[PDB]
Write a protein that binds this ligand. Structure first.
Ligand SMILES: CC(C)c1ccc(O)c(=O)c(O)c1
Ligand SMILES: [Mn+2]
Ligand SMILES: [Mn+2]
Length: 165
């Protein structure tokens, strides 16, 4: 009956997990490869290649949803460099849903299944903060390094999937 009331856009001090998520989509070998990743600053929690033709935005969505699922029952601070993802999570998703636009035949909305999955995932974490930071930062700050880590994780996930076959 609605979205998660306690969802916040700022870091919570006591969090169990501080993560970073990134999607990526490029054309490799005359084909669109995508990948998604959830990592800490120093280590990769989860990374996967995604079905061909997957957009960057959708990849972001999937990465985020994954972070949520893995964070179930715990306290999560998750950083995303995607304004699209951040917005969808905080605002657009719940509106689309409550409108009945997500389950309709209308393709005027993109990544409907991802959106639904995410809306469902938002309830898993005990306490949740989805924060947005500009990605690919020149800065040396922990969040910049986190973002770079995630980015590299996703891209590696895709490239690796391509050349293992
Ligand atoms: C091509 C650039 C702008 C691209 C935009 C989408 C981002 O979410 C991705 O992280 C990517 O690394 C940068
Ligand atoms: Mn990104
Ligand atoms: Mn990236």
């Amino acid at each position: 009956h609605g979205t998660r009331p306690d969802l916040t856009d700022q870091p919570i001090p006591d969090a169990d997990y501080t993560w970073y998520t990134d999607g990526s989509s490029f054309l490799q070998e005359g084909q669109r490869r995508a990948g998604a990743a959830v990592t800490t600053e120093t280590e990769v929690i989860w990374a996967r290649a995604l079905p061909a033709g997957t957009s960057a935005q959708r990849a972001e969505l999937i990465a985020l949803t994954q972070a949520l699922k893995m964070a179930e029952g715990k306290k999560l601070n998750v950083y995303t460099d995607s304004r699209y993802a951040f917005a969808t999570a905080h605002v657009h998703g719940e509106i689309y849903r409550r409108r009945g636009l997500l389950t309709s035949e209308g393709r005027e909305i993109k990544n409907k299944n991802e959106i639904l999955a995410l809306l469902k995932a938002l309830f898993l974490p005990k306490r949740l903060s989805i924060i947005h930071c500009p990605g690919h930062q020149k800065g040396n700050s922990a969040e910049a390094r986190g973002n770079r880590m995630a980015d590299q994780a996703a891209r590696e996930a895709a490239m690796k999937a391509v050349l293992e076959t």
